[PDB]
Amino acid sequence: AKVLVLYYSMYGHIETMARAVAEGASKVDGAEVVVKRVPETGKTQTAPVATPQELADYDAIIFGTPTRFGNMSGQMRTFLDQTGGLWASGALYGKLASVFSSTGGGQEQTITSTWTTLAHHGMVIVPIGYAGTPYGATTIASRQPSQEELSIARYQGEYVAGLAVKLN
Amino acid sequence: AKVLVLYYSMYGHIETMARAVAEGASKVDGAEVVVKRVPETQTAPVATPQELADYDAIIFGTPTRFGNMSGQMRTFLDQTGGLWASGALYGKLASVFSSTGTGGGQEQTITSTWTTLAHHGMVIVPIGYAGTPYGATTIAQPSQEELSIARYQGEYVAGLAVKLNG
Amino acid sequence: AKVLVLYYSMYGHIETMARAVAEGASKVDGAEVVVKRVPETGKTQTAPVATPQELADYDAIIFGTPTRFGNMSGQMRTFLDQTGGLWASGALYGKLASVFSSTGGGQEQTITSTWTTLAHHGMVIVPIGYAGTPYGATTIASRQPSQEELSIARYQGEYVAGLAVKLN
Amino acid sequence: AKVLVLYYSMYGHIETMARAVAEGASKVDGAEVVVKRVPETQTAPVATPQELADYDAIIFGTPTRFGNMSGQMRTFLDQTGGLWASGALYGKLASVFSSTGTGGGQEQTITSTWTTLAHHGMVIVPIGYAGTPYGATTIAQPSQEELSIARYQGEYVAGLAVKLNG
């Protein structure tokens, strides 16, 4: 029922993707969707900035990040480093997680490496399959996200939100 | 909810692990648990790729070969193209457990397995810290501790399968 | 000096890529380039079929495979499974390895997972960087490889062959 | 050939490993070996990202945090965008060694590091079977066996650097 779309955006492209994720999630009856960004560690930033413990308030979190050499961005990594207190209390255990990314190639490695990080919190991992990448929505970022990439982002939000409602 | 524990065992270590996973799953009210093994190239019946569509959750057990899953499990999964094209496993729960191999690689075996299951659109369930948080493992002679974690994994995934299905 | 381009091709697309790799390798003075395929485990197959121990005769091997769910193809995997005798004698130790792939997404995982397999043989791993993916040449396969994808394949052969000559 | 052993150490375990790698590298005729550490947030000087361009081979040492490299090494590598854009590390030799962390993950740390270095077009050198074939590791109190493997890794990579450069 409560779905957080949490992102870092350098150029606005992940932000555009995150708003498409959120639009998709909002199509689901019973899903309460909120959009936040992680602090800086350029396009003017838009969404409210999240604090680490806010994550515990959500049933699903959909994480959006540009790649940095096939890893999540330093900004999202630093934010997730500050979830040690959540880890020590089992706060995020069993909550749904899903990820979307943009280039800065490496998009697949960015997603799968993020999964491993979130598995340490015991989060349930939601890929999107054939419905690429199958691991999560991605974009190639001057070039803006295509309508096709945004449709896949919208799908991902909708799918994850439905799973959240089914579970909670 | 129907839970399949699907495994390949070379030395009996993964068989023992699979039985522990099934024991945990069988503790869950409303979970129907079956154990099968993949064909070669043990009491559990051998699975066909087609029957995987019948289950709400599948927990996959495999030995490690040079940092990835065993050839037997990989060959089996290689033959799920028809399932893939029809979306037969889409949205189903998946979880993985493994055995170490020469040069280690049990964590890698699990995360590599996740990649394959993500192509099928399966929902992936790690065990976290409630040894690796990715799934139950054995450094095999599985220890009582390792079996206790395998039991937890079955109970946890079967509970999730019942909560989302019945 | 001796460079093997070894592939499996289901639809001809990896074959097309492999011949571009080989063309690139052949541009290097002092590189002796040979193309072979792994046995079946459709377009009519062209290149001679390799046997596992032939790999020991080469200074560099450039491996081409379609993806199967983000792993190398069953055909290339089965072939590489039959290199246990090479492994036990240290036959492939220190030789150059590089990889290219095609979809069947998952292209990045196919390459990086192949690397881990070849690291068990102690092979030196050659990615291509920015010169995506940075991990190796790839194509999206009815659709044939684009001239851009083939140029990257050609680059990869040329680069690996030069490293082979520099080393041997 | 100039070889840099670049590391981050929390408890001294990776420092001891880095010194073993450097000892192995220093056995190689024509290899010039230097040890530096990445900045925080020990006798070895602290490295700047810019100076990595000066070396023929860089052997990276890091602890593991939740299945990936330490924040300190990752932050350092995060700041190699200028190097990346200019191709400063392209074609240079890279190798990795690591320490285990809570929930394991030392092999994953190495292969994740490989991915980052591949973006820079670095040539990646595993150690094979001459513990994981990906690079030297410690289950830390590094053992004499672990240090012997770290020495081998330095000697092997320095030999390769001399053969392709001088």
Ligand SMILES: [Cl-]
């Ligand atoms: Cl962006």
Ligand SMILES: [Cl-]
């Ligand atoms: Cl076994």
Ligand SMILES: [Cl-]
């Ligand atoms: Cl093909």
Ligand SMILES: [Cl-]
């Ligand atoms: Cl340390």
